[PDB]
Ligand binder design. Sequence first.
Ligand SMILES: [Ca+2]
Ligand SMILES: [Ca+2]
Ligand SMILES: [Ca+2]
Lengths: 161, 161
Amino acid sequence: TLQPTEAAYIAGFLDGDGSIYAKLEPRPDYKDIKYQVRLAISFIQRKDKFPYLQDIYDQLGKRGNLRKDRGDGIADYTIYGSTHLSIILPDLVPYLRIKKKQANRILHIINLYPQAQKNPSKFLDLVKIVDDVQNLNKRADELKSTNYDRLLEEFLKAGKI
Amino acid sequence: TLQPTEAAYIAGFLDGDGSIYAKLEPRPDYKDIKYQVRLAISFIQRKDKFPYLQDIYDQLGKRGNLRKDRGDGIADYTIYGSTHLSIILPDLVPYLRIKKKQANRILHIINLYPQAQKNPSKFLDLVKIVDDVQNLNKRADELKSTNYDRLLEEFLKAGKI
DNA sequence: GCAGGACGTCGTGAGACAGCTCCG
DNA sequence: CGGAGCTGTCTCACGACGTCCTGC
Ligand SMILES: [Ca+2]
Ligand SMILES: [Ca+2]
Ligand SMILES: [Ca+2]
């Protein structure tokens, strides 16, 4: 399993060529709350260095999806989902620096997600942390995410609250 | 001094946001061989994360030059010269992946620098390793370096050989 | 004559997603 | 429905220097 200096390297790389992010995705097929909250970490690189992704994917138990070419000659590696992530993030957080907060927020969401699914109220708190993470991945001079505001309205103007 | 996972993190980050390069600089004031060979590693980042550079810089022994703003809102940290590098690289080499070759080429260069100085022949070998590093930092589809060819002819047409 | 630091930059290699599709 | 993998992209944030400037 994952060694320390192996975990700290990955953290160092993630912090440079990588991403920890959360998004609110539309779910027309759903019932009450028509949005699944997605969670991910990703590594990005020019396709010719793909084997270096392959590496970081092997050491991480081969969780996630390797892509030798998004299409624009860039290769990447995305790990979706609270399952992979509840196992991966904790190994990395201690060494993460730039994206530590983001990671700690992802876990935060993972710990709150279960009871948040069918509770429109507690789901708003969850969606807040989606704003926090996206915000973290912004310059302090850009528009700030607003899924929380844009969804409380859809909520109210629909009965759920 | 520099702890293992600390060096591993830095290796990971250097492999992502950083750079190990060598360049042949002209010196109109030098006597025979009017080129100093320059060696460096650097770390690049948006100026709102300077403290993470400050961090790495403190961790290395405060060697190098932090620059809160190059001028285009991007901050960077650059370590010039065999002296810092002969101290820093060895700590990083074991955890470097993508740029490990570059790092060794720099050490190799530092190893031959002394005798290469006033030997136009041995300077040409040392110049070849400069071509090799710049080459490493290139797609395999761009013009390849050749300070070697451009300096051989120069030497020849000037008597040095 | 030597070497270290500052200044500026062209050109992409990234980041952080939105949207799409598929799964049992 | 409930989650998870595949497709494509705008917009910058990097890389890898070249170039001028120091001081002794
Ligand atoms: Ca980066
Ligand atoms: Ca990179
Ligand atoms: Ca980068």
